Amino acid sequence: GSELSERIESFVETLKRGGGPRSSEEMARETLGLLRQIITDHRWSNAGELMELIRREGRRMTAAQPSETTVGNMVRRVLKIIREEYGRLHGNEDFSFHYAQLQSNIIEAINELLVELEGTMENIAAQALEHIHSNEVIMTIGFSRTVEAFLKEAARKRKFHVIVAECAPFCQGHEMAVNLSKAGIETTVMTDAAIFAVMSRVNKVIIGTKTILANGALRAVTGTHTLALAAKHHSTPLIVCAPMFKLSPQFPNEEDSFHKFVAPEEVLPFTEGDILEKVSVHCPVFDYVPPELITLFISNIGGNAPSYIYRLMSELYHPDDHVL
Amino acid sequence: MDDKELIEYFKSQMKEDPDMASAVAAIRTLLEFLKRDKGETIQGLRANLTSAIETLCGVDSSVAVSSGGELFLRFISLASLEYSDYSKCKKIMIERGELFLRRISLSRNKIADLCHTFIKDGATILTHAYSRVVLRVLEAAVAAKKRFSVYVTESQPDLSGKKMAKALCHLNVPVTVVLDAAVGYIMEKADLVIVGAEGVVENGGIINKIGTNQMAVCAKAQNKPFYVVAESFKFVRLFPLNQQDVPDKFKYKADEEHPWVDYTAPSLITLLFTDLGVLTPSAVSDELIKLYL
Amino acid sequence: CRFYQHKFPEVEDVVMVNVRSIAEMGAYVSLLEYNNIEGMILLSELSRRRIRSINKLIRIGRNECVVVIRVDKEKGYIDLSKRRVSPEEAIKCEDKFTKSKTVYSILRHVAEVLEYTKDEQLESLFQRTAWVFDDKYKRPGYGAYDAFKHAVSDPSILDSLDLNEDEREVLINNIN
Amino acid sequence: QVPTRKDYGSKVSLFSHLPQYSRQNSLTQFMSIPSSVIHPAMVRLGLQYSQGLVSGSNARCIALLRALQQVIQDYTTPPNEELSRDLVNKLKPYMSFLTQCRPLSASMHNAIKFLNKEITSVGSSKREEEAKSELRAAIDRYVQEKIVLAAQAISRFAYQKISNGDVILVYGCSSLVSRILQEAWTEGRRFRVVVVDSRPWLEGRHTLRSLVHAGVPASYLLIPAASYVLPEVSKVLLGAHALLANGSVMSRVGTAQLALVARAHNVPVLVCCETYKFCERVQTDAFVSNELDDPDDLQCKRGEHVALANWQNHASLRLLNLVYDVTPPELVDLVITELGMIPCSSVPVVLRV
């Protein structure tokens, strides 16, 4: 049915134009709902033809927005699901050994994955209380709804200061701090020009992240590199509160347009005037935190050093799917 | 095989084929010895393979030879051979061995095709000494239509830097020899450092040519990435802790002092390049426990 | 000497062993029945759980029985195996091992009681004893077994060893 | 219902969660003598935990397992109530009581986890006597493999590194390091030792005795003088009351400080532990979960007067003696376990099986 075609096309259009939906978990859930729709409304009987199909949409998607690693690695994971179920049932060539039984199993596995994907905020939130010992000064940055859920869960049984830098290109730290203080955390907004002066007085640095690569190194909302570099100069322990699907298996310099440059209007508004002729304004939104400044990923399975993250690739994505 | 035409088979395998690595040569010799053994007993052959490893490592004691010997020794026997006549089970031995040799042969091209996607063009690769792995990754980088400068050291004992410079300017890539002593100087203008590692100890560090450690620590100071290329017939179960603990059987490769290798910690290394993939240098240990099983 | 009557163990014959060293190819096991048969039992594919073997030395020292498969008396190597052995064979080998250990302890008491301080002396004594014992019925090492079984009437009808008198008293005092 | 041991003093500001217990008010005060609500082995164990009679991690685990063996021995069963779930149902209270007496360390966590997994996984199709005897044999197999054989494997791994002439350093009454040094000096390697000890529990004298009774040269010095001897020290061989899920070695309260001053003096720091202590949780800083002893044992008898003689009166003087302390995985150069001489950061990838 062409309904799948129009749905996929509307999806990739929304991805190119402007984030849809906004919440990263919501985008992963939407990607999975779409991918399930492909496994109920297309022509396939083999497994190899379905892997080619999934790659033929995943290439389009991961080339639409090179910084939407969520949908990319979600397609990678459904590919891994295909590999696993086809190999367990029939079994390196993929043959059309059998039929719809495989599809029922695939739909069931995708339903399980989607259920694990929708209840991850609550997992990390229940994992908070063990980490936020009372009277900390937890320095976040930006607005990452997982970190807000983490903190306003942990502050239901303890008390701690919460510095929050705001992202200076366009301030979202403000909304995070407002949502925090509506739960009474004694939070402290500030512009992130002062991450180094007000770091010596910080106990633990709790940052979200947009995407975890396969070095452990991540790609997180801008100015978080310098926050991590300070919080390693002051050897405070970072905490990358990222669920497990914000995990692409690329590698740091194996990606061009790593960042995501947005309309330089936000950095130097058009109202400025003539001097907008001889100035190259850069508005990088995402910055590349190397893996040796991070300390402890807080994923839905528990805490993990960065040196365990590579193993997660070997347990989530197939080694021949790192090119989608 | 009375260990005299065996060492000569090894030396002739070297002299005839000059480009091929040392460990793969030792494993080819050991597999040829597996075939021409004239003994139908398995435990009488495992001891034979050990004695053969010994008479090889006696002449060319590179860490590669012993690493590959143990890898061979272990990989020829995985499944339940269920020794019946020691002939069909030996056929399983031999087929697994030839498969292993296939993988050892294609590993180098795998390394190139997996790594040369990290030399962002207009950079300045700095390398230490001649090693066909870095040479092949640069060859299949400039074959992917890129351009970059390459500084090569000298490595004073055997100036393999000059040889690398020759065989690298042979490809219209701007090459430069630069005093190994000056590894601290030009380290200011090398956006990354590539060295081929002739040994991968358990923790992640590398046992490489003499000048590797100082380069690793300089490039860690000024925060230049230290990419190391080293493959699965070079994983060593060793585990030193200071440059004094690399066993003396390797440090001289012969029998005012100066060694021929040295250790480099798993903190000064940015990313290992193995045929198993690209590994955070803490992956060497899980991959070694795994590969070895 | 030897537990079974043979001077070297024979092909396709189950025995017991104590492991000595695990390694790459296989796990060495010392069959303490035919003069320390150092047989390197095969390592399987899924038996290669030595990856995460919790304290591998937990298996390095024990008593486990295996069946010989391929043997060669040029390097003295006796490859064993433990894959498709049935529990009836297992219990039979255990009973044979118990009887053989009893016979070996009796023979060692005879040796250390007969001034057989020289190793060749114990060799000849145990060989003569085991020959005259298990050759009268073509039974594998059942001399002391049948002796201790029929020891309610007469356990020393095979006492044609006209050398020592402490052997008979020791046999009749131990089997009683 | 078993009461709640009441705290003692005022926990420091950053410790509104870790309880501060004293030794004087043993919980036994509010329990019957023919111990009724719990089993007598459990109260005996909790009471020799409280008074601080069982110190090391391996020792705590061994004693706890003997206690559990006793409990199983005198276990019986309510009618039509399956033993499978019911044993855990009745073993959780004793665990909470032990937590009251002195919080379950990491070794006890692993041990009770193993035992509960074993209890839930034994089929209801067994007789009482047979299930009990099988459980006891399994616990004994545990003690033999995880903590007794592990010592031998670890000694055999470590002996291949202890060269001749190098002055290995230690810390605290760590059973495994004393065993290593005994078993590697009764082998031939002539070396020295330099024990480092730490008030208020001078738990360094234990390893000092257990070493000099075995002929080893030695030297003893308190922990703050560490930065003095490290010029000569040529290895370091700490302990581990846990290994968290990222390599950060939890220990006594001096191990991190030693690892740090050691790296600063550039000497290898090779903590050795057994595969069972490797826990599942992970903590980064030394405050999210610890233990606080009776602080009143800090007061040292100087001159003629204990300088902290009266301690509760000064409302602006609050005491603490942390018991546990986390060294980060960038200062560890080795974790010797039976599963190998694994390196620091790659403990979770390789020991989660």
Swiss-Prot record, chain A:
Changing A100V: Found in a patient with Rett syndrome-like phenotype; uncertain significance. Keywords: Cytoplasm, Disease variant, Initiation factor, Leukodystrophy, Protein biosynthesis. Signal peptide: none annotated. The lineage of its organism: Eukaryota, Metazoa, Chordata, Craniata, Vertebrata. Acts as a component of the translation initiation factor 2B (eIF2B) complex, which catalyzes the exchange of GDP for GTP on eukaryotic initiation factor 2 (eIF2) gamma subunit. Its guanine nucleotide exchange factor activity is repressed when bound to eIF2 complex phosphorylated on the alpha subunit, thereby limiting the amount of methionyl-initiator methionine tRNA available to the ribosome and consequently global translation is repressed. Coiled coil: none annotated. GO terms for biological process: central nervous system development; cytoplasmic translational initiation; myelination; oligodendrocyte development; ovarian follicle development; regulation of translational initiation; response to glucose; response to heat. It is found in: Cytoplasm, Cytosol. Belongs to the eIF-2B alpha/beta/delta subunits family. SUPFAM superfamilies: NagB/RpiA/CoA transferase-like. GO terms for molecular function: ATP binding; GTP binding; guanyl-nucleotide exchange factor activity; translation initiation factor activity. The keyword Iron does not apply. This is Translation initiation factor eIF2B subunit beta. InterPro entries: eIF2B_beta_subunit, IF-2B-related, IF_2B-like_C, NagB/RpiA_transferase-like. One of its GO terms (cellular component) is cytosol. It comes from Homo sapiens.
UniProtKB/Swiss-Prot annotation, chain B:
Keywords: Acetylation, Cytoplasm, Disease variant, Initiation factor, Leukodystrophy, Protein biosynthesis. GO terms for molecular function: guanyl-nucleotide exchange factor activity; identical protein binding; translation initiation factor activity. InterPro entries: eIF2B_alpha/beta/delta, elF-2B_alpha_N, IF-2B-related, IF_2B-like_C, NagB/RpiA_transferase-like. The keyword Acetylation applies. One of its GO terms (cellular component) is plasma membrane. It is found in: Cytoplasm, Cytosol. The modification N6-acetyllysine is found at K35. GO terms for biological process: cytoplasmic translational initiation; oligodendrocyte development; response to glucose; response to heat; response to peptide hormone; T cell receptor signaling pathway; translational initiation. It comes from the Eukaryota. Activated by the chemical integrated stress response (ISR) inhibitor ISRIB which stimulates guanine nucleotide exchange factor activity for both phosphorylated and unphosphorylated eIF2. It holds the Pfam family IF-2B. Belongs to the eIF-2B alpha/beta/delta subunits family. Component of the translation initiation factor 2B (eIF2B) complex which is a heterodecamer of two sets of five different subunits: alpha, beta, gamma, delta and epsilon. Subunits alpha, beta and delta comprise a regulatory subcomplex and subunits epsilon and gamma comprise a catalytic subcomplex. Within the complex, the hexameric regulatory complex resides at the center, with the two heterodimeric catalytic subcomplexes bound on opposite sides. It comes from Homo sapiens.
From Swiss-Prot, chain C:
One of its GO terms (cellular component) is cytoplasmic stress granule. One of its GO terms (molecular function) is ribosome binding. Induction: Up-regulated upon endoplasmic reticulum stress. The modification N6-acetyllysine is found at K136. One of its GO terms (biological process) is cellular response to UV. Residues 12-83 form the S1 motif domain. Activity is regulated by phosphorylation at Ser-44 and Ser-47, which stabilizes the eIF2/GDP/eIF2B complex and prevents the eIF2B-mediated exchange of GDP for GTP, thereby preventing the formation of the 43S pre-initiation complex (43S PIC). This results in the global attenuation of 5' cap-dependent protein synthesis and concomitant translation of ISR-specific mRNAs that contain a short upstream open reading frame (uORF) in their 5' UTR, such as ATF4, ATF5, DDIT3/CHOP and PPP1R15A/GADD34. Keywords: Acetylation, Cytoplasm, Initiation factor, Mitochondrion, Phosphoprotein, Protein biosynthesis, RNA-binding, Translation regulation. It is found in: Cytoplasm, Stress granule; Cytoplasm, Cytosol; Mitochondrion. The keyword Ribosomal protein does not apply. The keyword Phosphoprotein applies. It comes from the Eukaryota. The modification Phosphoserine is found at S44, S47, S153. Belongs to the eIF-2-alpha family. This is Eukaryotic translation initiation factor 2 subunit 1. It comes from Homo sapiens. The lineage of its organism: Eukaryota, Metazoa, Chordata, Craniata, Vertebrata. The chain holds residues 6 to 181 of 315 of the full protein.
Curated annotation (Swiss-Prot), chain D:
Belongs to the eIF-2B alpha/beta/delta subunits family. Component of the translation initiation factor 2B (eIF2B) complex which is a heterodecamer of two sets of five different subunits: alpha, beta, gamma, delta and epsilon. Subunits alpha, beta and delta comprise a regulatory subcomplex and subunits epsilon and gamma comprise a catalytic subcomplex. Within the complex, the hexameric regulatory complex resides at the center, with the two heterodimeric catalytic subcomplexes bound on opposite sides. GO terms for biological process: cytoplasmic translational initiation; myelination; oligodendrocyte development; ovarian follicle development; regulation of translation; response to glucose; response to heat; response to peptide hormone. Acts as a component of the translation initiation factor 2B (eIF2B) complex, which catalyzes the exchange of GDP for GTP on eukaryotic initiation factor 2 (eIF2) gamma subunit. Its guanine nucleotide exchange factor activity is repressed when bound to eIF2 complex phosphorylated on the alpha subunit, thereby limiting the amount of methionyl-initiator methionine tRNA available to the ribosome and consequently global translation is repressed. Residues 5-14 are annotated as: May bind the chemical integrated stress response (ISR) inhibitor ISRIB. One of its GO terms (cellular component) is cytoplasm. The chain holds residues 166 to 518 of 523 of the full protein. It comes from Homo sapiens. Coiled coil: none annotated. It comes from the Eukaryota. It is found in: Cytoplasm, Cytosol.
